[PDB]
């Protein structure tokens, strides 16, 4: 059964260098050319580039985004293909996929590994502020009111987010992370709740960040006038 | 290069109906080298169809191609819980091999239009010199939706930052968060902070708000 | 600028059948979505429908999924609502709007005058 | 060369 698992990904500074390796096996990795493909964050996907087989020559090609840039080559004895990233920008940023290239005259992408991620930034490891998204006083009395946490200026990801220690799922909605021009991520987590519940019922979002070693406990409760 | 262009951006079909994506290419590419390829959030993207009838081996008989020169077609004969995902079409008959911009097949519901919060930023970040305020859209549907800053109506643009999550498991409606991000200095020379939210299913745009220094 | 007109509508009994058209002028609205709202007596105006453009869909409202059906001739510049099941409480102004956002926002910015939909027993 | 099946020499 074909196998394809990508290394070598991680976080690194603008300007340096990466060598992605792909492992591949349960098939005759000399004989199919391998090629690679990125995916930027809640982007579309990207070629960029393949290696011919040693039946073939052994040659690559890539497309210009990279070309200079990205280089590929395979190892036959230890069935390994690399992709060598120099030069790396933050547009680099992306999931990257070895893949395996169908043999014939419709050479698709056959086999994807399921990639390894690749993080372009200057940004140093820090904490998140966590901030209420306190409900208003002008919620309807007998109906529904929103509450929530602002988790800001955190590097890199992920953050974890629930409420009540996992007591509390039903209304909230914990959005993506949003890269900010600071280089830093920030992320909201709300929940709905009945607005007779606010002064009897206690929200607590839990929010984890293991990069910083950063764990807060915040009560949010509406803004005393 | 070869710019493929898929059409619609999402298409809404409930479970078991038939699922028609198009894929146009700006220039002439043979059968013979197209793609079509299957990703679901979080995971990689695998092979359906490829070729003139070439089907990726472990591929359910649901879903087939057809089409040639410009003008290509993904057919899902009846949409599977699992099948609700995004398509990519690729062609690789010319360099570089380029891929479409995806379609998402979603849930179809009933309109829902979207329930409006607006949060002031908090005593505890204002402490630190910026203020953020949060337009909350709760559980909406489609999509679509506009939301609009005004500060002492002043619209506001690229100064905000928008975040969506996935649709819902159970009632399939959409939630979107808005980020106004302003100097503390700026934030203090102002009085009325409001969102404008307009969605397909609202006759009029909703507006909350709230006045800077008000209980 | 842009003149909506609706027509069709009339009095029926429950159970009955009305097909209410949109046309548009000035403009043709092939790539604007267009949606009919209604507002009953001493009620706001409601969402109904939504015809976006030729292969993008079609959305409804809660109360009129299944009865409903909003379709488009380009060709005649004409939205169409296809009102069938008709309950007493469907009694209302039938409006149309055009969708100014291309990207199907909402930007309803031209309104007809209405047509009126009565259903008595 | 966008053949990566064959050696385009």
Redesign the interface.
Known sequence: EVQLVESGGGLVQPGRSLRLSCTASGFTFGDY?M?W?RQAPGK????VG????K???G?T?N??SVKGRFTISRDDSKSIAYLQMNSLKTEDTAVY?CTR???????????????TLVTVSSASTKGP?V????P??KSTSGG?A?L?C?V?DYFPEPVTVSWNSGALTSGV??????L?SSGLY???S?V?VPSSSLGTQTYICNVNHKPSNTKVDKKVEP??? | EIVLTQSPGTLSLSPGERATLSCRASQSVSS??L?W?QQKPGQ????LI???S?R?TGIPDRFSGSGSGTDFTLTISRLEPEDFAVY?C?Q?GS????????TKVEIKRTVAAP?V??????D??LK?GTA?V?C?L??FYPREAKVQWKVDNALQSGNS?????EQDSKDSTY?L?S?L?LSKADYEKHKVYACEVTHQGLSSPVTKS?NRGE? | XVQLXXSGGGXVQXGXSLXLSCXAXXXXXXXXXXXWXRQXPGXXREXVXXXXXXXXXXXXXDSXXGRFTXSXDXXXXXXXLQXXXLXXXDXAXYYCXXXXXXXXXXXXXXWGXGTXVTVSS | ?9
């Not at chain 1, 393949?50 to 087989?53: A, E």
């Not at chain 2, 990689?44 to 092979?47: F, G, K, M, T, V």
């Not at chain 2, 360099?95 to 995806?102: N, R």
């Open positions: 050319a090629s493909v579309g996907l990207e070629w393949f290696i011919r087989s039946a073939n020559g040659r090609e497309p210009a996929y290239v169908e043999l014939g005259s419709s050479w698709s992408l056959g086999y994807w590994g399921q990639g502020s901030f209420p998204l306190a208003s006083s529904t929103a929530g602002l800001k909605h914990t959005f993506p992370a949003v900010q920030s992320l909201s709300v709905t803004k005393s006038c | 013979t080298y793609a390829y990689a993207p695998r092979l490829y070729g003139a070439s990726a990519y690729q690789y360099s570089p091999w380029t891929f479409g911009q995806g329930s919060f607006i949060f002031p930023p908090s505890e970040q630190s953020s949060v909350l709760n559980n930052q928008e975040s969506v999550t939630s968060s980020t991000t709230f209980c | 060369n966008a053949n990566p099946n064959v050696d385009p020499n």
